[PDB]
Structure formats: C-alpha cells, structure tokens
C-alpha cells in the first residue's frame, strides 16, 4: 500500500479525468487522459513506466471525460465544444467528430459491448449516440435539470444517471425505459460507476457521504461517511474487493466495499484529485487532478 | 431532571456567539465614527 | 483574573509541594493562548502520581482533550476522550461528583470530534446515545440537525431545530438557528423580519446577533434599480442606523464596521471604503466576507493585479475549488492579454461544476468575441491564430443562437443579443478579408527563406 | 501614492549565524500573504524586537501623502503631513542591486531587491510581480510599525 510512479507535470493545465484499461486489448497498458490544456495524451504504461505514446489534439475546449472501450482498443474524448471526437489508440488518429451541438455535450459512457455512447443533455435527457454512426439513435425521455453523470454496467444490464439534485435515474439499456428513480440525495451527483458484479451502485454527491445503493431492488445498502469535501471520482477494484474515492481535498481514501472502512489513504497530491481509476488487476491505481501530476498507486 | 443542572453548572463556555462578533483586540469607534460623520458632513 | 494570574505567577516559581496549582493555572489560560493550558495540564498530569498511585481523574484528561480538539491533534484528543470515558466509567462511588455528567460531556466532545473527523456515522451514533438517556439536552439534538442539514436543508434538520426550540423557546442558539433556516431560500426577505423579532424582547436584550441578522437581511434588499424612487436610500439609512446603534453599544464589533463599509461602498465612496474596511481587515482578515469586499474596491480602481489574488485566497479554504460567484467577480473589466485567455480558463473551470448558469455561457461568448476582435480587426498577426479565430467565432455564434431560446435570465432579459450578432457578422467579414493577408504573409516568409538559402549556398 | 510595497511580516529567527555586532541583528522574517523573504537589519538597541512579533512594513518612495518627491535632505522645520506619523521605526536608504532568476529567453519570475540604508541591509526576495516599483539607484524608505495584535 503506497505510491509506485509519480509523474510530475503531467499536463500544462489541470487534468479533469483519467482513463485506464482493464482487459487485454491493448488498453490496460496504455493510459488515456484528458485535461483542460486540449491535449489528449495517450500515455503507454510500459515497462512499469508511464511513457507518452500519442498526443492527440483538436478539441477547442478542455477535455471533460475520457474512457477506454471495454471490447475495443480505441478511445473517445468529449468536451464542452459540443464536438465529441472519436480516436484510435492503434494509430493515434481521429475516427470522427460527433457535433453534439449547440452545447449539449457532457461526460461519455462507453457501452460494455462498445456499440453505444451515452451523453448528457442540458434538457435533462440522456442521448444515446452510436459509436459507428454518430447520429442520435434514441434518447431517454426523463427530463429534469441536467445529466451530470452516466455509467454503463460492466455486463450491460442497468444504467444510472446523476442529476443536479441527487436524482438517480435507473434506466434499462436492454429496453430503453426508466425502471427506478432513487432520490436518496439532494446534492448534485458528480460521478458514479457500477460494481463489477452490477449489484452495488456508489453515488458521489456533494455531501461527503458514500451512500451505496442497490440496483436489483432500488434500496440503500448503507450510508458510508466519505470525505469532508465533495467526492469527485469513484471506481471499483476489478477483483471487486475495494473502491477508491476521489474528493475535493487532496486526499485519496480507499474505502472497503464490504466493511465500509478506509483501508488506506494517499496525501501525495498537493491539489485536489479529479480522476481515479484502477488497473487491470486492481494493484495500480492511477490518479490525476489539478496538481497536473499522474500518481500510480500500488496496493498489492 | 437533575442531569441538566448537573452539567451546565460545572462546564465553561469560553466562546459563544457574541464573542465572535467583537475583535480579540481593542478597536473602538473613535477612529470609525469620525469618518462616519465626516462623510455625512460633506453630503 | 489579573490578581489571580499574579497569584499563580507567584505560586509557580516556589515549590511548596504544589499539587493543584497547575490546575488553576490552566483554568485561566483556556481563554488565552491555548498552548499554556496544555503545558499546565501536561505538568499537572504527572504531578498527581508521586504522592500515591492514583489514576488521573477524567475531568483533567477531558479538558486537555477538549483543548487538543480545537487543534490539529484530533487523534490525540480522541485518545484523551476515550481514556476519559473509561476512567469516568470506573467512578462507581463518585455519585456526588456525578461521573455520569463527566461521561456525558466527554462523549459530547467525542461526538463533536467525530463530526469533525469525517465520520458522521459514529457522531450520529454517539449523539443518539446521549439522546436515549437524556432528552432534555439541547446541544446534541441541535448538532444532529446540522448533520442532517449537510445532505439538505429540508431533511430532519428543519424539524429537529424547531423541536429543540419548542422544548426551549428561551434558548438564543435554537431561535437563531430557526432564523438560519430561512437563509437558504431568500424568498422570505421582508417576511423574515417577523421571525427575527420574536426574541427581541428586553429580557433577551441586548442581543447583537439578532440585530446584525436584521442588518444583513436589510442589506440584502439593496442592489436594485429602484434607488431613484427614494426607496433604497431609506433602506441604506435604516441599515446605517442599525449599524450605528450596534456600534455605540459595542465599538469592537467588526460586523457593524463591515456593514457600514458595505453601505458606504453602495453610496459611491469606494475611495472612502478602503479606510473603513482597513480596521476590519487588521482585526481579523480571515473571514470570507472581507476578502471579497476589499477585492471589490481593488477591482473597481482598475487594479486586477491586487484583486485576482484576493479572490484566489478566499478559494484557498477547504470548502470547494470552483465557485461561481468568485469567478463572476473575477472578470469585471479585464482586457489585457493575460486577463482574457486565462479568464476563459477560469470561466471553463467554473462552468465545469455547474453549466446550467446562463451568465457563464454569456461571458465565455463575450470574451471569445473580445479575443476575436482583438485578432481580426487590427491584425495583421500570426496565421494559425487567424485559422483558430474563425472556429472560436463560430462557437460563439452557436452559443448566440442557443442563448436566445432560454426563458429565465439573470433578472434581466437577454433581448440585447442582436448587437453581438451584428458584431460577429462584421468579424466574419473581417476574418474572410484577413485570411488573404495571412496567405500574403505565408508567401512573404517563403521568399525570405528562399533568399536566405541562396546566401547559404554562396557560403 | 508612491507605495512601492506593502505587506504584513512576522519574525521567525534572529541572528542565526550568531550576533556579530552589538546594536544590529539579522531579522529573517517571512510574509503572510505575498510569501516573500526578508533579511531586514534593525537597530535592536533603540527598537528591540523579539520573535513572533508582526509588523506592517511599507516601502515608500516618499513620506508625503501627495507624493511630491522630496529632493532628499534633513529639514526638521516642516509642517507638511508625513506618513511617518503612524510608524515607530522609519529609515532611508538607496536600493543598489535587483537580482532575479532571469534567463536568456523567458523573463524572471522571482526578483531580489538589495537596499542599503547607509549600512543596514535588506533583501526583499520573492516573486517578480510586486517588485515592479524597485529600480536600481533610487531612494526608498522603510516605514514599519509593530503590530500589537
């Protein structure tokens, strides 16, 4: 339990998200990050070392979200420029540019089958674009204020949505319909992710509480006291034993998903961490933030 | 019950609401009300 | 207290088998420097073991842990509280000293620390353990409400606060908290006056908090275009009278000086606002209000160099990183090279946490237009920037198209969207004119490199 | 105005290589907002200072509020307003060296003003943003006042 790699000055501007692979499809060894300096740096985590492989540009505004396809070695990057641009980690080139204009562009959500791409909309809907089409296939008709977070389940059975007022919208990607609406929070939901078994659902609100709800029967499994700041990013360990939590206070606590206890905490970031993600096995925990430093956290 | 008088009679409240309002030093109104009146005189 | 302090300053040097002198010495320095009381407790803890093997009473350990609670030794204070609870339980025969009350206060401080130790579950559990044994206690029942209030101001907070007031209406803290509840939604602007005059009876007088709450709620009514109707001037006079009244009875109150500085700034005296805010800053500048109020005066006098730092210092606190109001006050009259592109970066940082606001998405378009006109009117500059300026202008135009459809605005309709549209049209024209200049400069650099290569061939 | 600098300082160490003289000592002070170093040398005899004390140092080019840029000479018989009326320790010197971390391409980020008040030195080391009012071969004052806090 410590820090393995320490990338100083990983970017010119603050990093807001980090993407790292989990499968064996040339993704776990490459780190894709998106920062406000308009550089989609494709870092290759080769020889236990974070080496730059590609430097993709083109986004007018800073990158808001980065994620790696589960069943495919290509990636995509969105921003507030309403131009969601697809990329390829095999060649460092651009596949296409989904003009989700005028402004309706938010964090991405790679489907587990790598065939659909969810994007939040200012009208409150969740537009589901096609990876190989780019056109609006079908939009979820659940209005409100705005979609602040969207996540796909690893096996593709459910889909949640974080609103600006703590409204979890449990959708069904198998049929495209709203099943449950969990409203156990009143804060804007920043980010959320599905458990590797698609059984638990962590919510990262602005109350400092990691309220882990259930998806099968839409009930709260327990209130966990998180940080004192707002939990920004949260990810599950691929072996499903723990989950890290990125908050707004230069602190990375690794909370236990089973006992609701912090097993370790990192304080090596001088600024707040914005993105946290696991490795393909769950030992290395990549982290980014306003410090513009990528820290690789090893927890054997 | 007696538990109420049992605690409020032995405790000590060094800071309360009003203490926060006054500065811990000495800043009287002699240097404040002077300008407060000078600004009114000119109008 | 002075004669007492002199008396302990005499008992300290000599050693007439002192046992309880350090207890008294700490008992007075709790208000003063917090370290001296810690030193007195540190020496007094060890002075109680030489006469006999007697365990330290839980009161001294509870007080020393309380002293450490305000400090950064949260874990050490937690250990002090736990050991105090364990000793206090061991007093099975100290019924006259009420070991139960000692345990109650120790657990109260411990729950407060857990609430401060990023662990609200344990603090809720401990405060409830106090409730189940003594429902006539106020502070625990009030702290549970704030715990619930972090998640929202409509949860059990708003119910527990009123219930604690119903059990004790003569408690200033609970009634002031009832007043605090209405502050989340300022729709009760004129109506909150009534609920703030409930305990303004002479028995509770004088209460500076209710008076300053009245002053604040009366200042909130300012910043309106109805001043010429002889309405806001009367409001300024009333608030100034309140501040003068709380100044006469209390000259050392800083909030009165803050309020008179605010109204004087509203009266158009920004040169004379610095002097009045100077005393408030010199007393204690570590209050969120003074940083912003002074940075307003700095940004008003064309001093962004002294205003951006004062806005960043207020954000240094452990509460958030990207607040909307601070960045809104950040960009006021920025026109320089380093105050436009970076202004876009901070605007994007602000809009990242909550893009639903219209002011941010208007200001980004405005600053984009400013840079576009700063590169496409008198320039004649680098070519790549001409290629980027058209993209920025197109994004600004798309935002212009998008903004007109929104219903609500910042209390002022954005029907003045025509003028920037005409501006963007003429900038599009100028950019199409200046791209030719870019090509001319491209040819110019090509021929200069050719006429340099020929000379290098000569050599 | 003429305020070339203004900021609160506090003393953390006094003659750390050991006191050399008998009336002067080194004051390795630090700032509170601008985060800048200070190596001021005050007359410890007439103006004693102990550790932890805070003072309001203000480097000013002139002692007059209107800023008339006095020629420089001792004229006690002067009824004009003087800024020194609210300071317990005022000095007069001439900055002689402005060292910074300059390079061949990009401008400096941290300067270091070296001013000599007829023998008493001071290095106001810090960022290169608030030291714009310091130029070599120019007269400056000190204008410090200890804070009671």
From Swiss-Prot, chain A:
Transmembrane in keyword set: no
Alphabetical UniProt keywords: Acetylation, Cytoplasm, Nucleus, Repeat, Transcription, Transcription regulation, WD repeat, Wnt signaling pathway
GO biological process, one term: transcription elongation by RNA polymerase II
Cellular localisation: Nucleus; Cytoplasm
Gene3D superfamilies: YVTN repeat-like/Quinoprotein amine dehydrogenase
WD repeats: 10-53, 58-97, 100-139, 142-183, 184-223, 226-265, 268-300
GO CC terms of this entry: Cdc73/Paf1 complex; cytoplasm; cytosol; euchromatin; nucleoplasm; nucleus; Ski complex
PROSITE patterns registered for this protein in UniProt: WD_REPEATS_1, WD_REPEATS_2, WD_REPEATS_REGION
Stretch forming the signal peptide: none
Pfam families attached to this UniProt entry: WD40 (PF00400)
Stretches that traverse the bilayer: none
Family membership: Belongs to the SKI8 family.
Protein purpose: Component of the PAF1 complex (PAF1C) which has multiple functions during transcription by RNA polymerase II and is implicated in regulation of development and maintenance of embryonic stem cell pluripotency. PAF1C associates with RNA polymerase II through interaction with POLR2A CTD non-phosphorylated and 'Ser-2'- and 'Ser-5'-phosphorylated forms and is involved in transcriptional elongation, acting both independently and synergistically with TCEA1 and in cooperation with the DSIF complex and HTATSF1. PAF1C is required for transcription of Hox and Wnt target genes.
Subunit structure: Component of the PAF1 complex, which consists of CDC73, PAF1, LEO1, CTR9, RTF1 and SKIC8. The PAF1 complex interacts with PHF5A. Within the PAF1 complex interacts directly with PHF5A. Component of the SKI complex which consists of SKIC2, SKIC3 and SKIC8.
Protein's UniProt name: Superkiller complex protein 8
Organism, scientific name: Homo sapiens (Human)
Gene that encodes the chain: SKIC8
Curated annotation (Swiss-Prot), chain B:
Annotated region (Interaction with CTNNB1), positions in chain: 1-33
Protein name: Parafibromin
PTM field: Phosphorylated. Dephosphorylated by PTPN11.
Function as written in the Swiss-Prot or TrEMBL entry: Tumor suppressor probably involved in transcriptional and post-transcriptional control pathways. May be involved in cell cycle progression through the regulation of cyclin D1/PRAD1 expression. Component of the PAF1 complex (PAF1C) which has multiple functions during transcription by RNA polymerase II and is implicated in regulation of development and maintenance of embryonic stem cell pluripotency.
Tissue expression from the record: Found in adrenal and parathyroid glands, kidney and heart.
Subcellular location: Nucleus
Assembly, per entry: Component of the PAF1 complex, which consists of CDC73, PAF1, LEO1, CTR9, RTF1 and SKIC8. The PAF1 complex interacts with PHF5A. Within the PAF1 complex interacts directly with PHF5A. Interacts with POLR2A, CPSF1, CPSF4, CSTF2, KMT2A/MLL1 and CTNNB1. Interacts with a Set1-like complex that has histone methyltransferase activity and methylates histone H3. Found in a complex with BCL9L or BCL9, CDC73, CTNNB1 and PYGO1 indicative for the participation in a nuclear Wnt signaling complex. Interacts with PTPN11. Interacts with SETD5. (Microbial infection) The PAF1 complex interacts with Zika virus French Polynesia 10087PF/2013 non-structural protein 5/NS5. The interaction with viral NS5 proteins may reduce the antiviral immune response by inhibiting the recruitment of the PAF1 complex to interferon-stimulated genes, thus preventing their transcription.
Coiled-coil positions: none
Native source species: Homo sapiens
Curated annotation (Swiss-Prot), chain C:
Superkingdom of the source species: Eukaryota
UniProt keyword Transcription, yes or no: yes
Biological processes per GO annotation: blastocyst growth; blastocyst hatching; cell surface receptor signaling pathway via JAK-STAT; cellular response to lipopolysaccharide; endodermal cell fate commitment; inner cell mass cell differentiation; interleukin-6-mediated signaling pathway; negative regulation of gene expression, epigenetic
TPR repeat residue numbers: 19-51, 58-91, 104-137, 138-171, 173-205, 220-253, 254-287, 288-321, 324-357
Gene Ontology cellular component list: Cdc73/Paf1 complex; euchromatin; nuclear speck; nucleoplasm
Entry's transmembrane regions: none
Molecular function as annotated in GO: RNA polymerase II complex binding; SH2 domain binding
Subcellular location: Nucleus speckle
Keyword Transcription regulation: yes
Keywords on record: Nucleus, Phosphoprotein, Repeat, TPR repeat, Transcription, Transcription regulation, Wnt signaling pathway
Tissues expressing the protein: Widely expressed.
Primary role: Component of the PAF1 complex (PAF1C) which has multiple functions during transcription by RNA polymerase II and is implicated in regulation of development and maintenance of embryonic stem cell pluripotency. PAF1C associates with RNA polymerase II through interaction with POLR2A CTD non-phosphorylated and 'Ser-2'- and 'Ser-5'-phosphorylated forms and is involved in transcriptional elongation, acting both independently and synergistically with TCEA1 and in cooperation with the DSIF complex and HTATSF1. PAF1C is required for transcription of Hox and Wnt target genes.
Complex and partners: Component of the PAF1 complex, which consists of CDC73, PAF1, LEO1, CTR9, RTF1 and SKIC8. The PAF1 complex interacts with PHF5A. Interacts with KMT2A/MLL1. Interacts with STAT3. Interacts with SETD5. Interacts with ERCC6.
Protein name in UniProt: RNA polymerase-associated protein CTR9 homolog
Organism name: Homo sapiens
Gene behind this protein: CTR9
């Amino acid at each position: 339990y410590g820090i393995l790699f320490k990338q100083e000055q990983a970017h010119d501007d603050a990093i807001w998200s980090v993407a790292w692979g989990t499968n064996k499809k040339e993704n776990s060894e490459t780190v894709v990050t998106g920062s406000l300096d308009d550089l989609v740096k494709v870092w290759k985590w080769r020889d236990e070392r974070l080496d730059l492989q590609w430097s993709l540009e083109g986004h007018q505004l800073g990158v808001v979200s980065v994620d790696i396809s589960h069943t495919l070695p290509i990636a995509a990057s969105s921003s507030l420029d309403a131009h969601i641009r697809l990329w390829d980690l095999e060649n460092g080139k651009q596949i296409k540019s989904i003009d989700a204009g005028p402004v309706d562009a938010w964090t991405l959500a790679f489907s587990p089958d790598s065939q659909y791409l969810a994007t939040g909309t200012h009208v409150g809907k969740v537009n589901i674009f096609g990876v190989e089409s780019g056109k609006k296939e079908y939009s979820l008709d659940t209005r409100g204020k705005f979609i602040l977070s969207i996540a796909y389940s690893p096996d593709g059975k459910y889909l949640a949505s974080g609103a600006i007022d703590g409204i979890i919208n449990i959708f069904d990607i198998a049929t495209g319909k709203l099943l449950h609406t969990l409203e156990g929070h009143a804060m804007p939901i920043r980010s959320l992710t599905f458990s590797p078994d698609s059984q638990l659902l962590v919510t990262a609100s602005d109350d400092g509480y990691i309220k882990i709800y259930d998806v099968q029967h839409a009930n709260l499994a327990g209130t966990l006291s998180g940080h004192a700041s707002w939990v920004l990013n949260v990810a599950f360990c691929p072996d499903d034993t723990h989950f890290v939590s990125s908050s707004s206070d230069k602190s990375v606590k690794v909370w236990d998903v089973g006992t609701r206890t912090c097993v370790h905490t990192f304080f090596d970031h001088q600024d707040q961490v914005w993105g946290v993600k696991y490795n393909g096995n769950g030992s290395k925990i990549v982290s980014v933030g306003d410090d513009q430093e990528i820290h690789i956290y090893d927890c054997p | 019950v007696d538990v109420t008088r049992d605690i409020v009679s032995r405790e000590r409240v060094w800071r309360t609401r009003t203490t926060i309002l006054q500065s811990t030093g000495k800043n009287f109104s002699k240097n404040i009300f002077a300008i407060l009146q000078s600004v009114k005189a000119r109008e | 207290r002075d004669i007492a302090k002199g008396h302990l300053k005499k008992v300290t040097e000599q050693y007439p088998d002192d046992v309880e002198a350090w207890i008294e010495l700490a008992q007075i320095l709790e208000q003063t420097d917090i370290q001296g009381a810690l030193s007195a407790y540190g020496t007094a803890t060890r002075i109680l073991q030489e006469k006999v093997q007697a365990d330290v009473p839980p009161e001294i350990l509870n007080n020393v842990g309380a002293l450490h609670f305000r400090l950064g030794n949260l874990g050490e204070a937690k250990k002090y509280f736990l050991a105090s609870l364990d000793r206090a339980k061991a007093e099975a025969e100290h019924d006259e000293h009420y070991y139960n009350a000692i345990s109650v206060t120790t657990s109260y401080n411990l729950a407060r620390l857990y609430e401060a130790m990023c662990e609200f579950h344990e603090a809720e559990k401990l405060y409830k353990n106090i409730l189940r044994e003594h429902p006539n206690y106020v502070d625990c029942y009030l702290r549970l409400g704030a715990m619930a209030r972090d998640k929202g101001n409509f949860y059990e907070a708003s119910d527990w606060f009123k219930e604690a007031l119903q059990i004790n209406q003569d408690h200033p803290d609970a009634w002031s908290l009832i007043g605090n509840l209405h502050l989340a939604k300022q729709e009760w602007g004129p109506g909150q006056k009534k609920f703030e005059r409930i305990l303004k009876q002479p028995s509770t007088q004088s209460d500076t908090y209710s008076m300053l709450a009245l002053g604040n709620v009366w200042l909130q009514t300012l910043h309106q275009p109805t001043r010429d109707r002889e309405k806001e001037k009367r409001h300024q006079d009333r608030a100034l009278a309140i501040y003068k009244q709380v100044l006469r009875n209390d000259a050392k109150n800083l909030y009165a000086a803050n309020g008179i500085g605010a109204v004087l700034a509203h009266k158009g005296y920004f040169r004379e606002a610095r002097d009045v805010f100077a005393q408030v800053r010199e007393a204690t500048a570590d209050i969120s209000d003074v940083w912003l109020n002074l940075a307003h005066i700095y940004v008003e006098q064309k001093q962004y160099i002294s205003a951006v730092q004062m806005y960043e210092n207020c954000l240094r606190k452990f509460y958030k990183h990207q607040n909307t109001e601070v960045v809104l006050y950040l960009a006021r009259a920025l026109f320089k090279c380093g105050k436009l592109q970076e202004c876009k970066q901070t605007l994007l940082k602000a809009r990242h946490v909550a893009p639903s606001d219209t002011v941010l998405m208007f200001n980004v378009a405005l600053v984009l237009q400013r840079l576009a006109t700063s590169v496409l009117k008198d320039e004649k500059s680098n070519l790549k920037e001409v290629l980027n300026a058209v993209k920025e202008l197109e994004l600004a135009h798309r935002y212009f198209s998008y903004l007109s459809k929104v219903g609500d605005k910042m209390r002022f309709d954005l029907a003045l969207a025509a003028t920037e549209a005409r501006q963007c049209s003429d900038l599009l024209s100028q950019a199409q004119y200046h791209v030719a200049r870019a090509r001319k400069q491209d040819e110019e650099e090509r021929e200069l490199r050719a006429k340099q290569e020929q000379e290098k061939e000569l050599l | 105005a003429g305020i070339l600098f203004e900021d609160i300082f506090d003393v953390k160490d006094i003659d750390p290589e050991g006191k050399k003289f008998d009336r002067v000592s080194r004051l390795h002070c630090e700032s509170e907002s601008f985060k800048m170093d200070l190596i001021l040398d005050v007359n410890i005899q007439i103006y004693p200072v102990d550790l932890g004390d805070k003072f309001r140092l203000v480097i000013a080019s002139t002692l007059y509020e209107d800023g008339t840029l006095d020629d420089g000479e001792y004229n006690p018989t002067d009824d004009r307003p003087s800024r020194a009326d609210q300071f317990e320790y005022v000095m007069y010197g001439k900055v002689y060296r402005i060292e910074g971390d300059e390079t061949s391409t990009e401008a400096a980020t941290r300067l270091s003003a070296y001013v000599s008040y007829g023998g008493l030195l001071m290095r106001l080391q810090g960022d290169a943003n608030n030291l714009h009012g310091f130029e070599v071969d120019s007269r400056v004052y000190l204008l410090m006042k200890k804070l009671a806090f």
